[PDB]
Amino acid sequence: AKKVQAYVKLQVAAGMANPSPPVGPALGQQGVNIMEFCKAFNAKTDSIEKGLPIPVVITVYADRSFTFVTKTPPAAVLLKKAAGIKSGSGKPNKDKVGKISRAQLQEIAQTKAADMTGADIEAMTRSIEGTARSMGLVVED
């Protein structure tokens, strides 16, 4: 009925499904178990982030099931796997904050234009460009 209903950002981005152990016990309100942890996410966690950050929206349903139009492959992962240097803020004014170039932007544009779109496909491309450039350091290209 109500989409998600519990919005808690306490889930490791991509990798292992439902990585509660690292995430910490402070968001225990959500009723996730071993039933909704490997239903749909387990079978579609390949073409988004293979070793990179791709936060996922649970989209829990009050219809006693779990399924929705899940988010497309993250730009956070696009600009972290096409870069090489996975760094960013915190140490952005001291050293490399990651790489950002037109190639990563084109990759994310041709990749993350399925569901993570905005006021244009090129607007989601500018989203990936902001998620790659505003880290604090960008490759010159």
């Binding site: 989409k3 779109t117 905005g118 607007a123």
Partner: protein
């Protein structure tokens, strides 16, 4: 910063885009959702165009002073919130469809999506030929 000069300017700066393009829209302020409405206005900006000025400075007197030069039905008070999405390739395009489909879901209310028509006498949509 809705000052006198900025209003007198943006009234014409928003009448121009709807007098050069297609009809615009308006969306009230009743109940917007976090993603259900935000990504619906996203898809609105996506399909309608990247030049639409979704802002609203549609005061009744400002409209009657600036916009009412042509298509004087716009001068009528827009007593609801407004989000304008014009359309490039013809009249009654995807933006009008999205506005008409938003009056009942995926937004608060679209104020019936009356729009701007150059004839201003055809209540029916631009499908006059039966074919």
């Amino acid at each position: 910063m809705a000052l006198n000069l900025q209003d007198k300017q943006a009234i014409v700066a928003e009448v121009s885009e709807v007098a050069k393009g297609a009809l615009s829209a308006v969306v009230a302020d009743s109940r917007g959702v976090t993603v259900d409405k935000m990504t619906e206005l996203r898809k609105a900006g996506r399909e309608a165009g990247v030049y639409m000025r979704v802002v609203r400075n549609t005061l009744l007197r400002r409209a009657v002073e600036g916009t009412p030069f042509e298509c004087l039905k716009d001068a009528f008070v827009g007593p609801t919130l407004i989000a304008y999405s014009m359309e490039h390739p013809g009249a009654a395009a995807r933006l009008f469809k999205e506005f008409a489909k938003a009056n009942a879901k995926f937004e608060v209310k679209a104020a019936a999506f009356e729009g701007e028509l150059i004839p201003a006498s055809q209540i029916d949509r631009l499908a006059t030929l039966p074919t």
